[PDB]
Amino acid sequence: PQITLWKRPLVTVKIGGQLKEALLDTGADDTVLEDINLPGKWKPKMIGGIGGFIKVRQYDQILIEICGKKAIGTVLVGPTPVNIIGRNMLTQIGCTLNF
Amino acid sequence: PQITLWKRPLVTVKIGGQLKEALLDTGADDTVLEDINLPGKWKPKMIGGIGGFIKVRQYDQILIEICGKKAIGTVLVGPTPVNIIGRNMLTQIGCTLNF
Numbered sequence: 001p002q003i004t005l006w007k008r009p010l011v012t013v014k015i016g017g018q019l020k021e022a023l024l025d026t027g028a029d030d031t032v033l034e035d036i037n038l039p040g041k042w043k044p045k046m047i048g049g050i051g052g053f054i055k056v057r058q059y060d061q062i063l064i065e066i067c068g069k070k071a072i073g074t075v076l077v078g079p080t081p082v083n084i085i086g087r088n089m090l091t092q093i094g095c096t097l098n099f
Numbered sequence: 100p101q102i103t104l105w106k107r108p109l110v111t112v113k114i115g116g117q118l119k120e121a122l123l124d125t126g127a128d129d130t131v132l133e134d135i136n137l138p139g140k141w142k143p144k145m146i147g148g149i150g151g152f153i154k155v156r157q158y159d160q161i162l163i164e165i166c167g168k169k170a171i172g173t174v175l176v177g178p179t180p181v182n183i184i185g186r187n188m189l190t191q192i193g194c195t196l197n198f
């Protein structure tokens with residue numbers, strides 16, 4: 001799919017048997033979700049954005065399926081106001097910007 | 100240009116005779132710059148991100164040139180940690196996501 005940007009680039013993602021919506025986000029280095037419980041071990045981490053920093057759980061080697069394309073990688077879990085798919089996943093699904 | 104996302108999608112922007120670097124950011128509704136002083140009237144506004152909110156100056160009908168393509172629109176000026184080119188400008192330069 002080529003997608004234009006007149007609306008938020010929201011996609012459906014399947015992660016851990018759950019269905020979520022998340023923003024395809026070229027401005028995000030990493031993938032961060034809020035409304036989700038992922039099992040197993042994880043390491044504490046902080047990430048900063050426009051208003052400062054949030055503490056997140058870092059989970060490694062997590063499978064996600066984004067618009068029906070698979071990727072495995074780091075998913076940060078924490079109090080982001082919007083689920084975001086960051087560059088760490090976007091590259092694995094071959095996502096590019098075009099103008 | 101088609102742009103892969105292994106590195107931050109940073110472009111050069113010319114605004115008010117000044118040269119800045121900014122991130123092409125599909126997860127941002129609006130365009131927000133920090134290291135810049137634009138002339139004339141503006142309205143107060145707040146925007147939220149990861150970490151919460153910041154107060155910004157809203158400047159309307161501002162000309163920007165991003166990779167030498169012109170756009171005119173709202174530019175928010177405030178303490179963002181990274182200059183961001185948002186969807187309000189991305190649509191004007193014909194930017195799309197592809198995968």
Ligand SMILES: CC(C)CN(C[C@@H](O)[C@H](Cc1ccccc1)NC(=O)O[C@H]1CO[C@H]2OCC[C@H]21)S(=O)(=O)c1ccc(N)cc1
Pocket residue numbers: 023025026027028029030031032047048049050051082084086124125126127128129130131146147148149180181183185
């Ligand atoms: C959370 C998004 C839905 C919105 N953000 C745009 C987003 O692209 C920011 C844009 C951004 C970029 C750098 C610094 C601050 C904000 N990225 C971001 O917070 O990424 C974080 C997750 O991955 C990490 O990589 C960079 C910071 C971490 S935002 O910067 O807060 C934002 C919010 C509102 C407007 N109008 C414009 C921008």
